[PDB]
Amino acid sequence: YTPKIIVDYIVKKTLKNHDIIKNPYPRILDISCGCGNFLLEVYDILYDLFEENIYELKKKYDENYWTVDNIHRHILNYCIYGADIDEKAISILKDSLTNKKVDESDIKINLFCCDSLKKKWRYKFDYIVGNPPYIGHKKLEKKYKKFLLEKYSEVYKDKADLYFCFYKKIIDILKQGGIGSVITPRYFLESLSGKDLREYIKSNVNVQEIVDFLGANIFKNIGVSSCILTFDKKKTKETYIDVFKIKNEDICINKFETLEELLKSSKFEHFNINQRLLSDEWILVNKDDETFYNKIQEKCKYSLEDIAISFQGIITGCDKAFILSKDDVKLNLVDDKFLKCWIKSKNINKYIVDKSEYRLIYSNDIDNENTNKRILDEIIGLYKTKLENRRECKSGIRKWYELQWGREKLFFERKKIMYPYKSNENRFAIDYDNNFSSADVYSFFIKEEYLDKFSYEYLVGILNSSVYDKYFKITAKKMSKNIYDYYPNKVMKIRIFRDNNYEEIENLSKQIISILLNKSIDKGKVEKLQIKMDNLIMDSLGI
DNA sequence: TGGGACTTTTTGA
DNA sequence: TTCAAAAAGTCCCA
Ligand SMILES: Cc1cc(Nc2cc(CN3CCN(C)CC3)cc(NC(=O)c3cccc(Nc4ccnc5ccccc45)c3)c2)nc(N)n1
């Protein structure tokens, strides 16, 4: 059930400036009405609009048709259209619409109980409103997904969400100069699946307003990040997008009776984006952040991808059969050549890695099963059946006791920089202990030809700085509230500089490392050091 | 007695 | 062959 305030805002956004005198026959469609939250409000708005200009319509058009008593019949005959797949909800909505007036004379309501994505729509619509469903993967049928791939190939790929196709439908059946307004999951704004959908939206319609609630709990007891999209097919030359980006994600939607008061408040920020200048990922930042990002990009002559080699952690396929507590007795059964240090995301802090509390049995170095039979029978064999259900074990590529994705031994066993893949801040650490990690920690190492130009200490010094934290978070992908995705595709794009401040930055980073490593804690001074380093970085970037 | 955050491994390429 | 992205269900406490 969509919140009433958002429904009212969407309906008013679509219908407020409709010239009922010029076009007293508007077609407003809900594609996922369900109980009919949007359609009842549309009915109320239309009834008020018709009654306000009833005598003007009576004078302009047929005098006998336009009467106050006939408004209900006219709205139900020519104006309101709803579609859904639940017949009980359709009947409830039809009863609610009939009870709005209180057959007597051929009362007909244009409500359809059908698959909206498969219906052959006989005519397009002036206005479209609503909230497409959020049910995918588990709910879809094998035959249904194949039909989606064939029919909606321009927005639907692999395991993409269903509502993508709904966008494809809403644009297609929107009359020229019409208005559409929906509330959907926000994930398509920056996910790789939505690239085709975003291109389709950009090239087919004009986006007017984007309200981005980020991780705010819009829907009660549902963990979906929602956003409101308003678009039109009007012949416009400028096509600038208003963006209302939320600031406080911990708000509840009761601050005012109207969403406009919330948007106009300090809990939201507003900025304009030129649609023609949109990239393929829809960064959607304001002017100050854009200037900051542009200056940093211009100042830096190198990037992480240019000078570093990145990789993903070990994927064992069954962690319980290979990861043990470093104090476990069964580790006496394993030769120390097979044991490697193992860390988690929580082990990663700024500039350093916590001491490994776990050991990984690098079983790929076990050649035959007869020599190390004790390890296989008494440690790894406890999950052997599960290990045999892995894809590569079935295909015959991987032995049952081997790691499914053991990567390269030498990549991990070197000096390198590690970072968690999901964090609330930049946490890049130098690994001095040849630590191994799961896929929750990514790693990279400096290329040989860039070793003299760049050092690990300097890299972690600038990367953990507040400047680079803001710089990354500007374009970073947000998947949860206060949690960003630190993945190689976005991390390795980070640009880095090298100037006369290099030596002092590296020295401050080394001081921070030395303070962090020493057992007796005096960590407060690190903050002070950090501050100084940030200053230098700003002096380098002119910010 | 109800309500949200969390890391392992499955899978396309 | 192996990369890396993203899908995905179990749990507890005041
Ligand atoms: C926040 C919360 C959790 C909770 N239990 C709970 C907690 C935890 C984690 N803890 C442990 C203590 N800390 C060190 C960290 C937090 C784990 C579990 N079980 C688990 O079975 C568990 C443990 C680790 C990872 C995962 N797979 C997923 C992780 C993340 N995304 C996913 C999305 C879809 C599907 C699966 C996951 C499941 C259950 N109970 C209450 N009250 N609150």
mmCIF file of N, CA and C in Angstrom, chain A residues 27 148 181 188 212 237 248 254 260 358 362 426:
data_model
loop_
_atom_site.group_PDB
_atom_site.id
_atom_site.type_symbol
_atom_site.label_atom_id
_atom_site.label_comp_id
_atom_site.label_asym_id
_atom_site.label_seq_id
_atom_site.Cartn_x
_atom_site.Cartn_y
_atom_site.Cartn_z
ATOM 1 N N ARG A 27 -7.556 11.084 -20.312
ATOM 2 C CA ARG A 27 -7.504 9.663 -19.989
ATOM 3 C C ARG A 27 -6.363 9.429 -19.008
ATOM 4 N N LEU A 148 9.340 -12.194 -21.372
ATOM 5 C CA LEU A 148 9.866 -10.868 -21.068
ATOM 6 C C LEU A 148 11.128 -10.574 -21.870
ATOM 7 N N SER A 181 3.836 9.650 -13.994
ATOM 8 C CA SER A 181 4.386 9.837 -12.656
ATOM 9 C C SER A 181 4.255 8.531 -11.888
ATOM 10 N N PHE A 188 17.574 1.137 -10.291
ATOM 11 C CA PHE A 188 17.915 1.263 -11.703
ATOM 12 C C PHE A 188 18.692 2.535 -12.012
ATOM 13 N N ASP A 212 14.508 11.518 -4.921
ATOM 14 C CA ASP A 212 15.327 10.385 -4.500
ATOM 15 C C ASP A 212 15.343 10.330 -2.977
ATOM 16 N N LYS A 237 12.604 22.166 -25.481
ATOM 17 C CA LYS A 237 13.961 22.304 -25.996
ATOM 18 C C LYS A 237 15.033 22.239 -24.917
ATOM 19 N N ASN A 248 18.411 13.837 5.267
ATOM 20 C CA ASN A 248 18.233 13.025 6.463
ATOM 21 C C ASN A 248 17.428 11.794 6.067
ATOM 22 N N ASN A 254 5.778 11.942 8.244
ATOM 23 C CA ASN A 254 4.640 12.607 8.867
ATOM 24 C C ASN A 254 4.930 14.078 9.139
ATOM 25 N N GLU A 260 5.173 18.327 -0.604
ATOM 26 C CA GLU A 260 5.845 19.545 -1.047
ATOM 27 C C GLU A 260 6.531 20.247 0.115
ATOM 28 N N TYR A 358 42.042 -16.210 11.881
ATOM 29 C CA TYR A 358 41.604 -17.399 11.168
ATOM 30 C C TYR A 358 42.688 -17.869 10.208
ATOM 31 N N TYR A 362 44.889 -23.958 2.214
ATOM 32 C CA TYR A 362 45.029 -23.836 0.763
ATOM 33 C C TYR A 362 45.138 -25.242 0.182
ATOM 34 N N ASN A 426 36.016 5.368 3.410
ATOM 35 C CA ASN A 426 37.203 4.806 2.777
ATOM 36 C C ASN A 426 38.062 4.110 3.824
#
